[PDB]
Symmetry: C2
Subunit: 173 residues, 2 copies
């Protein structure tokens, strides 16, 4: 079993983004991918999303990609790539907007999306067991500890998203 | 022209597309602007949004652009273009997903985003009256005489449509969040 394209291309890219940042420096890269930090840049749409692709530390990228590898691979595997992409896009945007709103356009990371995967995977397994998707009991808290690991709101919004779609999804059948 | 840049470009973009669809026919333009309909296109990212650019009838694009211009406008003036772009992006995404999910990839319209702006606008005025934004009581009602003139003043069945609740949810979300700061 190998992880799907979505899950893979995200990991690799975030590794390639960390790439540039280490070399060129955090500053230079965010100058390129950061959430619109000036009106002049407001129409540069990629910015609404590319901020997820940026990490500032070893631990930061390491845990985010582990949660993304495990959750993100399970979702793409059982429910498909489309399901992963949307959860990602919406959660990246929502969280990005809540972050930008309260603390400035200078941030980066795949933690907003991770929290969405945590709320989506966990919720479905609980509501729609047979669906195949669920958050392993042991890992519930390597992650609820990643949920309580931070105490954030730019993380709640993302959780809300995961939770939202998961509700919709365990709402069909 | 008083309407801001976002509001303005979106309307022009919709007219330019509707025209093209007319032309090349709805089929062709969807081919290009429809939510990914085949794995081969899954990574053509514009598609996840561009679906909102297409309309299938005169009355479709009309009321859509009317509410967009009335509502979109207001937001963009009183709250900035950023606020309108993000509302447009998150609601286009969440509502197109729901749609696709339950009814496939062939759709279109700016109705999902209209449900979001209405919800936001309305909700923000009710919670943050002073923010300056609100949905004119009559207007609110030209939505409610309507949820209540298809639901109550009935016609079809119940227009509380699949993709329109997610769109609404988004706006109600961001509104609830913006009326939460102060």
């Amino acid at each position: 079993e190998r992880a799907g394209p979505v899950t893979w291309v995200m990991m690799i890219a975030c590794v390639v983004v960390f790439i540039a940042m280490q070399i060129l420096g955090d500053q230079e890269v965010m100058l390129w991918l950061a959430w619109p930090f000036d009106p002049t840049l407001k129409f540069e749409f990629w910015r609404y999303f590319t901020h997820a692709l940026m990490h500032f530390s070893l631990m930061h990228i390491l845990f985010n990609l582990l949660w993304w590898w495990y959750l993100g691979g399970a979702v793409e595997k059982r429910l498909g790539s489309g399901k992963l992409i949307v959860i990602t896009l919406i959660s990246a945007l929502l969280s990005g907007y809540v972050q930008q709103k309260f603390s400035g356009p200078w941030f980066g990371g795949l933690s907003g999306v991770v929290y969405a995967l945590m709320g989506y995977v966990w919720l479905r397994g609980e509501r729609d067991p047979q669906s195949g998707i669920y958050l392993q009991r042991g890992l519930i808290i390597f992650a609820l500890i990643w949920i309580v690991a931070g105490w954030n709101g730019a993380h709640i919004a993302g959780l809300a998203v995961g939770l939202a779609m998961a509700f919709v999804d365990s709402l069909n059948a």
